[model samples]
Target: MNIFEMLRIDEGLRLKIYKDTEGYYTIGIGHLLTKSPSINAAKSELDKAINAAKSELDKAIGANTNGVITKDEAEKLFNQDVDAAVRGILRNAKLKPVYDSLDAVRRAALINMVFQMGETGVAGFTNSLRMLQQKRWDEAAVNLAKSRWYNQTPNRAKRVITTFRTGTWDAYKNL
Candidate 1:
């Protein structure tokens, strides 16, 4: 309950953001993460998703508990999802031209951003992406800093960027 970020998505649901250094750029989304109803539900859903994604028929396919899985299940599912995506991006970026030098986390986050952002946030930020491809970390960060995230929730970008730079997650420390 220590850190909570309100993300302004196109759907306008004010999706919540939780950061505990569990290894993700944003709340679990995409093919795997989206399966979970909340950040805490991702891990368990992910485990079943992976088991099913691999065999094409998972044990918990289409399974949900009133749009939520237990905390224990979510932790396991999302962690595996991150691990899988990380390996996939590292290999995929090695082949994709634009993402050649991108870090696994950055690339992964971008992918999630694009998917979640839809056509505009994904397609509209063409120039910003070019800067990232050019290996412009500061410019990339600056370029993205203009986005309307914090306006929805103050200091959102600053906190995330701080974690991005210092690699620290102390938001819920004394909670």
Candidate 2:
């Protein structure tokens, strides 16, 4: 199974889309590597990241829980905080424009592969990056998704991309 799907993203835990307590999910910010087991294990990790980003727009909110912030203030902070170690992983795996042509769906699916295998995963992006640079979006996306890095099921990765895109939201503007 895609590591992300194995995490049971559709559940109610806040960080549900990525890691689980079992130590078998993505190895990034909220997963097998982090100190916490994820406070909201069922919440959209993407959404949580986005909301964390938004809160930075008003630090007086989460970080500024101290009440020094007010509405409309220039966001004193910004989140979307990828893990530092993961950042190192990204730095090592550089890509050019050809790799940029993969559609959103393909990229999203590849993300799961990356989380599991790190940047060196052969089935994920190494060769697929070249295909992308060549502008073979269809072939690239399909083939990359088909490649199995980290012993993962690419089909499950595809499903993860689908759910991540439509993870469902019940807005409660007022916290």
Candidate 3:
């Protein structure tokens, strides 16, 4: 993609971080930001805008929080967080090529894993990554599920595992 196209696509994805949809104080991409935002002094237009955004989100989610931010502000946070996630994925030179070769859904699943487990946590999955590189899909899925993250977040694991097994993104449903 060209510069403009890439920018727009990135913006579009960032805009989609409306809520966690999985139950959490989340906004701005997939980061688990606590919804309780506080304004030291809500006077500036920027402050007003952020406060407005926070209020809207809080109202939508039936939450009473210190802060709610606009979709634009949300995108700024999303861009920041997503940049880190991207860099985290690229940190391992070996994983870099493996990551680039996957389809969008598969890439999303892996990135979600990174977001959930953290870069260091995912870095421990040497066997799983190798299994993925070898096209051993079942092994990769099983190995992923065998982790502590799987035990802690069964629902999340299921969705990601489904993607690992079928190569498709199954979006969140309030459960």
Candidate 4:
């Protein structure tokens, strides 16, 4: 499976605004509006859009006002977030080589991790990164399992780890 398809299943699309597990305002397939680089970059346009629908935006921001977005808009945001995640992975000097050494499936798994945890968060897994760099897939998976992320999102973590260990898309393909 490609990154888009995999992420669609993992992140789950949501057109309306809602609070995430951490209580951050999020919308459109895990797009954390309060902390999104993509949203920050286009703040002016977003602000104008919000102003255009002031009351609606206010209510949405107030208590999950159920402010909805078109599917096209949701897809646009998802693509931008995915692009940012990939760039974050590529820009990491330490991960660049490791990323290059992996097959596309494994690369997608790495990007998926970065997508959820951010690059810095992924960077914290020093031992796991080292294991990945050395192509010790099983060891890398084991190291990843020993993390708060795995504990917080066990199912997703298992799928990603499986992808890493098997070097295939089987974990995500059927989904």
All candidates: TM-score: 0.42, 0.38, 0.59, 0.80
Candidate 4 least-lDDT 10 residues: 57-66
What TM-score should be assigned to candidate 4? 0.80
Ranking by TM-score: 4, 3, 1, 2
- The residue ranges of model 3 lying beyond 4 angstroms of the native Cα positions read 1-29, 32-67, 170-175
lDDT string, candidate 2, 6-62, tens digits: 333422223222344343332222333222225566567745554554443234234
Clashes (backbone N, CA, C under 3 Å), per candidate, total: 7, 15, 5, 0
lDDT of 3 at 85: 67
Give one digit per residue, the lDDT tens place, for model 4 in 1-175: 6999998899898777765665455677877655222345477866555444434434434533336776777787788889999888889987788899989999999899999888998878889988988999999899899999999889999999999999988887655
User: For candidate 1, lDDT tens digit of each residue in 1-175?
Assistant: 1111212221122112222232221232222322323456678776664443433212333453333344444444444544544344445432245445566445533543433333344445666667667766667667666766534433545544433333234431332
Q: For model 1, how big is the CA root-mean-square deviation?
A: 11.0
Kindly provide the TM-score of model 2 when superposed on the true structure, using C-alpha atoms.
Answer: 0.38
Greater-TM-score candidate between 1 and 3: 3
Measured by TM-score, the strongest candidate is 4
Of models 2 and 4, which has the larger TM-score? 4
Candidate numbers, best lDDT first, in rank order? 4, 3, 1, 2
Give all candidates' CA lDDT scores. 0.41, 0.39, 0.61, 0.79
Return the lDDT, model 2, position 9: 43
Model 2 accuracy (lDDT, Cα): 0.39
Question: On a 0 to 100 scale, what is the lDDT of residue 60 in model 1?
Answer: 32
